[PDB]
Amino acid sequence: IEERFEITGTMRRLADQSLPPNFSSLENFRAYVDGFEPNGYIEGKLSQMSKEVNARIEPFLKTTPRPLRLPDGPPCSQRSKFLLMDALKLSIEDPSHEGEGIPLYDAIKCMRTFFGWKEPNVVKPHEKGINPNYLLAWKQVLAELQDIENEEKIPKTKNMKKTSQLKWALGENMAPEKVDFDDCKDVSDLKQYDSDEPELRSLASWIQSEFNKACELTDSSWIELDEIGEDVAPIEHIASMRRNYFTAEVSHCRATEYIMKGVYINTALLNASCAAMDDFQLIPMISKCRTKEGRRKTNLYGFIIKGRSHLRNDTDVVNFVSMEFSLTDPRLEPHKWEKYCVLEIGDMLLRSAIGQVSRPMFLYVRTNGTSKIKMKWGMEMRRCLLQSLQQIESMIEAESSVKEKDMTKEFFENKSETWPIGESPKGVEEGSIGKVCRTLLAKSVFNSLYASPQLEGFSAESRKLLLIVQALRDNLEPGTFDLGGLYEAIEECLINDPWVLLNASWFNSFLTHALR
Amino acid sequence: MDVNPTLLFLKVPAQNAISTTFPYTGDPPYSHGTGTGYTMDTVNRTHQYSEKGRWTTNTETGAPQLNPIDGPLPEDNEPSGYAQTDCVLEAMAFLEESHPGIFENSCLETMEVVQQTRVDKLTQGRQTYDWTLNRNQPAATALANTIEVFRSNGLTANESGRLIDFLKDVMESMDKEEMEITTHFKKKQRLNKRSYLIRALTLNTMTKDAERGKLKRRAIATPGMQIRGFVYFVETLARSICEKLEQSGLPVGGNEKKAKLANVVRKMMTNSQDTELSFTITGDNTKWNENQNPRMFLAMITYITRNQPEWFRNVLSIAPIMFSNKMARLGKGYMFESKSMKLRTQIPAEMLASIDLKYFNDSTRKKIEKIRPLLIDGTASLSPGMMMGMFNMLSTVLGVSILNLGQKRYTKTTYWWDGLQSSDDFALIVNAPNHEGIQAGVDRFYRTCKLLGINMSKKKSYINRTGTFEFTSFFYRYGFVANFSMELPSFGVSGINESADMSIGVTVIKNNMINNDLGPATAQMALQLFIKDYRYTYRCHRGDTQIQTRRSFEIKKLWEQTRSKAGLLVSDGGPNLYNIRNLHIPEVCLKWELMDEDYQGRLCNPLNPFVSHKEIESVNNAVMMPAHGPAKNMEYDAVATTHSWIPKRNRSILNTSQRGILEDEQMYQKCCNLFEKFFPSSSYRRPVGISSMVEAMVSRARIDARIDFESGRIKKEEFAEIMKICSTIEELRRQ
Amino acid sequence: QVQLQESGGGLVQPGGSLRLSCAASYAMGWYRQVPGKERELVATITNFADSARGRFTISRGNAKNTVYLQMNNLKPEDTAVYYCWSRETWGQGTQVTVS
Amino acid sequence: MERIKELRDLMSQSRTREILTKTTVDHMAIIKKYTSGRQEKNPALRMKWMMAMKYPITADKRIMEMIPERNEQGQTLWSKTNDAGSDRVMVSPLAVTWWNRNGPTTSAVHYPKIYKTYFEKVERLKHGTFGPVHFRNQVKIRRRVDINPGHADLSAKEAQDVIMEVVFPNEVGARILTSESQLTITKEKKEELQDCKISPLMVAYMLERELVRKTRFLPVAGGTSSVYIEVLHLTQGTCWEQMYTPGGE
RNA sequence: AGUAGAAACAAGGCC
């Protein structure tokens, strides 16, 4: 038998219309191809082609790269789902573990530990919402917390009443009703969804200080790691010792506290959204630490009210309202709290040598939102620990490949070697390996917190320029074909995100300090 | 003092700490709404990069098509799709000369495969655009629907069970006056010749999500089922060809890519003497897919298949012939909002041809105005170039031809170049006695690339001295450096099931320790964090804790019931015995000797109602879409336990007019289960033949009853009962 | 890329003084090697080892591209080849002999 | 008896009768994969989202007659509402743990005989002897190596006939294995697994894994042996080497 | 309002 695959009919005519411009049939084109032999045709067209088609190499020197321009506009605002630098903790000193316990009872017990409650009043308005709604929501939360305190056994999860206050605060019945085009065509206002470049905003100095204090040590251990199989190999012992060193370095770090806060908050929010889709739910922000003395402790930052969460797509938004205690007066950096409503709820007395301070104690209240993807990715914030400590362990291994011996202990104790991890007005400041660990952990945590497309684009297009600059510093005669194009590609990612703008400022500082 | 991590690069080289520059710990960007805008923008951009071509109107589809081939040579560095037929034919000829026997051999193996390939091979594919319903559906479903429609219309050659016969039927369908399709809202609708042609030549456009590394979103395309067989054969030929080319890196993995990159850099630099300078270009190609004309792929394949049986040439040429006339569906549509009346609306994309432009903004208004002339029956003709890397391997072949065209035998000059090409990305090592020689070599390479419709992205490319470069997120600095930030997203619970997730997590940790140079202490930390997240996700806590969950009661009673609690699986609330030495052992086997026999038997019980196995392909294979790469499959070691359940399905089909698909699913699955019970090898080896179900089932009932009496439980009473029941079903099938 | 040349060594009295200087082509410093031993940390730029603290001062002129080591009240135990470095890059060392 | 009886019951109803009559054997695979269920793009997100629901997993109908509808306190274990496109019913994860504390028990003595590869790995590691860790730069060079340490010198297709004749002796067809190595393998794995009742498909899959040779490209430094490659993560690192000798040697 | 960012969510459909 002979296999027959014949092109005929319409499919043949299509073959006659898929040839070069000056061919009439597939038969003729195939005959030409079979009869074709190389006779120096690339050279002829290369000679005839215009010489303006070139890839001239522009030398890259120390004076070539210019600082990246940052956008100008109103200062950048806060985007986090919870307070990071201005958080306050009410504690009970209980022996329970992280997941162990019941949320509502722990929150009520922690809140009863504080005395000095005052009738709440407006301090700094939202500037775009209805602050009285926030005030009434706070008082409602307090009242219903007492209502739970009265009854027999604290419920594991509580549902709140759907008053107009939280109906507005949670954005209920505000989605436009879906209709058919044939019924709405004469409406003049009918147009596309607003699709334009985000608003431009200039960097502010608050994000820098927030990152600075996100890398600082603390008086608690915010990581209680799980169990592993007992180490049997010497390499396993080395790994365990290294891991213990890093845990001692990073556990007492605000980055770990932020990691735990985000993980717990997002886990609770996702579980409540998946379970109580319809009805508004109360969730106290809880985080459990261990003191220097070793006594376990619980901490209550505030409360989250989750709203209707009928989330179908990964981008669908669940709205909630977050309330958090703090002592930082919002009258000093108002531009950082554009979307917050801040009340005055009490006074706190912390033991200090200056008599006793008797500071005010405010409540930051805001309406925020998330999505299934955002919740899932925020509940995997513990991989920031991985990223950071993998980088540090790569450093240690690379250095130990030079000296034939493990170099961890002297790195962590002697602290002789230091890396540039920041710049002071005096100059570049270097810190021990532990400070590098904390700095990288904070960088990863902020990447996970302020994640956005701007961050990805800037990261890629700035890694390109970083590689070029590294090649320059290595004396490898780097060259570029269109550096202005790369600069324009980098500068289009900087729009309004505080984190990416801070990264761009850091990159400019690195260029200024480099190229010398 | 202000902390600044970037300053760390002043002491640690950039590549030794490049992992810090990968923000892969946050949510990747996602698209929210329609992808119609991106589709229209891509169509217009592809058509305007070839504006100087010549216009024609297809006599079959009636759509306007633009042919830029052999068009005017470019006079600027902007992207251009004006590829020259003679130049590319000469490049392929030189490729053949440098590698004699490549095309003939590759065609021989491809001919073998094509003439022995089966239809079922088309089911092994992800979403495909079913034209019977004008929507994306699983490959198997679309194939079944198309086969049903063909059989209803009279095209039954595919009953031979051969993919070549299926393609013969597909082509024969092109010459039919009137086909018939089914729609549910069942209604039988008639499609004329032109409508069916456009439905078979069209592509479905969507928006790509979870794409890290760029601020703007892109659009991707999915073809139909009529054209996927030709694409399969063409890609088989291209893969067989590239496997014989060491300059290609597309048909290999990552480690092979690194090995070939190291080999080529060492070859180029080492052979270079002290007088010759060497430079590496880390090049990316701008608008790679939009500038590759299918007609040029037709030319390349017809040159490859010279002196071959004409049927082979025809079957391999059908694919580019259809791509040259390919159409693209605009997309989902556009959603409008009216705040004055507080409402929203969703207009399908098919109305873009006639809908007024008052609702659209300036950018979208202009895009629609520019794309309207190409709109034919709600879809836009996209002849000039490929949409999204459907011919990856042929593009790699063209790039490898360009790379080989500078072997110093065709350059005819002191300078020369080599390197590695993987579609849309390349590393080019060019050597020349002086900087002028390097400049001339790179200029000529760029010029030759522009003669083949390939453009080099000057903004994303840079040249330095050899020894430092990048290639597909692999940073080479006197040796490849591990990143570990590309695999970070794969350190969580995969989402298959409990046992599968555990095994996949431990295996991923192991692999990233082997390949991506993950440290021991870091690996231990990853194991701890993964175990924590696993327990918190599946509500399976240690059991000795007081963490109240929806599953903490049964777990606690199982804990208190067990005597040797060290053998309990983490899924059942037991301790974790994993460590760096135990990352290559399944959990069940690591705890086998510690389990109590009662719990061991209850766990690994074949009669459990949870374990379900469908086919040999889906036993222990998990499809994990890696970050910054195409979808990939992994073999994970796991023991079939009661924890190997499969999760719930979507269940939203119940509210759609396509609700009868579930009844058909149930009936097909019942019949398949009956056949499997009749033919146990149905899953492991897919049955072949031309008979129908009931014939085989009844006849095997005859024989098995017979022989199982000749020794077994059956009795004469039962054997005769089965024989006459077989006769009963026979007469039932008669009527 | 970085080359380093030390100057200012020689024969000196005990209780004498000596100014080492290292010209370069980054943090800098000074290490020393006695005939019977490997490397000993002296100074880095500031930090000084126990055996030389208060006696010796490290300084640098970034405009001259030079790092200096001002040694005072020298002991016979300071007798070593003093090597300058940059950070991977090491000088050839300058002989200091105290007696 | 039963099998032909549900066959007749299926043929009783017109739609299934038509499906059985017009559908040919070759199309078996197609219709078996015919489904409306799309393959998940983000499995982790939905696994973390579905497990927060009640009745998130699926199980055969038989579960309704082995496990009670509710446990001691009344937490529901299974529901009678079937899945989307199957006769299986959606059930809660507790029904898993319940099955592991009061479900039927069997004799799992033969699982070690089936899952030969994994238990051989465990035995090899249990008797291994570690050594000192030496810190020095390792020149990892990339090489093609065989990962499976129990491959019987057979390819996929070469051992597929052996596997069928071991598990499905009647569907072998024309093939009768010529090589005597295959003869002995068939004899051994036939007499060893003569009454094992795990599943034909899993038995075939594990026999394929054990006998079929598989190869992959990996960065290695030393070793190169099959037994030394499975522990390549534990013996070789970036700057450290851990001497190891599996229990086999 | 809010989330978010080149288009969307701020429940959908069926009676």
Add this chain to the structure above:
RNA sequence: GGCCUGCU
């Protein structure tokens, strides 16, 4: 008010 769905 009653009931259905949450990648179709």
